């Protein structure tokens, strides 16, 4: 019922795949394999995992040719416009991002 | 290369500080884009997320946990957004790594 996501990267801790509704020419998603539902529900034990996700995001941004710049976004809850209750880090690039960020 | 955040860190220029420990400082944005808008910055002067390294793994995780904890303390219980800008296309203007935390209104999509 959906298209198969291009998985850009995977390791023992996380998965990186393209957003089916891209908000920029490059828009991908970094998710942990541990199903943390929302960033507001991350805990101290997740510290290394969270750092790893950000490192994977910036490494994948380099790989995707986002050297002129990009934006990382994490949405929490209703007011953050979170839609899937598993942690997703958005990486957006390939165009000039605006301010404010929504 | 020091940025204006160096004057925030050394307390020479004023800031509304929400949290501080030996690894980071959290303070309100002076041009807030939401009713609550603050910045979480490392004391280590990493200039941008694209220049973070494997050695920074723990620090990066700490910054996200501090962002999350400060969001709770600021009453953002119905949602919020974390944003990191890198480079010109990301609209980065201050070249000292920071996480924006925005809440207190419905954030829109796309995020800029
Ligand atoms: N079938 C799908 N394949 C790839 N991405 C999806 C799919 N369904 C939803 N998404 C995206 O997953 C993201 C979830 O992030 P969030 O809205 O922050 O929870 C959104 O940007 C969606 O567009
Ligand atoms: N003296 C200051 N105190 C607090 N926030 C500041 C100060 N100078 C600049 N800023 C904010 O720093 C942010 C820089 O974010 P960016 O444009 O993502 O680099 C902007 O939101 C500015 O409003």
Q: In what order do the strands lie in the sheet with B36-42?
A: A7-10, A14-18, A26-32, A89-93, A70-76, B80-86, B99-103, B36-42, B24-28, B17-20
Give contacts of B 83-112 with A, CB under 8 A.
83-92, 100, 102-112
Q: Residue B34 and residue B54: Cα distance in Å, rounded?
A: 33
Q: How many CA atoms lie within 13 A of B106 on its CB side?
A: 3
- Solved with: X-ray
Token pair of B54 as six digits: 């494997």
Going by C-alpha positions, the residue among A26, A18, A24 that lies closest to residue A65 is A26
**Which among A67, A100, A39 is positioned nearest to B108, based on CA atoms?**
A100
Chain B environment of A98 (Cβ under 8 Å): 91, 112
Residue A40 in marked binding region: no
Residue B70 φ/ψ region, left for φ over 0, alpha for ψ in the -120 to 50 degree band, beta for the rest: alpha
List, comma-separated, the residues after which chain A is broken, a break being a C to N distance over 2.5 A; otherwise answer none.
Answer: none
CATH class of A1-102: alpha beta
Element (DSSP H or E) covering residue B47: none
Distances (CA, A) of A22 to A40, A56, B16: 24, 19, 36
Contact A24, A97 (CB under 8 A): yes
Residue of B nearest to A67 (CA): B87
Q: Within an 8 Å CB–CB cutoff, is residue B47 touching chain A?
A: no
DSSP secondary structure letter of residue A23: S
Strand, coil or helix: B61: helix
Query: Does the Cβ of B56 fall within 6 Å of ligand 2?
Result: no
Cα(B16)–Cα(B30) distance, integer angstroms? 9
Is A27 a pocket residue for ligand 1 (Cβ < 6 Å)?
no
- How far apart (Å, rounded) are the C-alpha atoms in residues B112 and B60? 23
Taken in order B63, B68, B70, B74, the sign of the CA dihedral is: positive
Q: Would you say B23 and B40 are in contact if contact means Cβ atoms under 8 Å apart?
A: no
Are B52 and A58 in contact by the 8 Å Cβ rule? The answer is yes
CB-based contact, B50 to chain A, within 8 Å: yes
Contacting residues for B19 by C-beta, under 8 A, at least 6 apart: B25, B26, B66, B69, B70, B73
| Angle of the A47-63 helix axis to the B57-73 helix axis, nearest 10 | 110
| CATH match of B1-112 with 3.90.1300.10 | no
> Nominal resolution in Å?
1.6
A61 is in an annotated binding site: no
Q: Which residues of B touch A90 (CB under 8 A)?
A: 111
């Amino acid at each position: 019922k959906s298209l198969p996501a291009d998985i850009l990267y995977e390791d023992q801790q996380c998965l990186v795949f393209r957003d089916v509704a891209p908000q920029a020419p490059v828009h991908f998603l970094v998710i942990p394999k541990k199903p943390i539902p929302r960033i507001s529900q991350a805990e101290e034990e997740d510290q290394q995992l969270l750092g790893h996700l950000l490192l994977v995001a910036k490494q994948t941004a380099k790989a995707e040719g986002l050297g002129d710049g990009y934006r990382l976004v994490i949405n929490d809850g209703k007011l953050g416009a979170q839609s899937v209750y598993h942690l997703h880090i958005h990486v957006l690039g390939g165009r000039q991002l605006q301010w404010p960020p929504g």
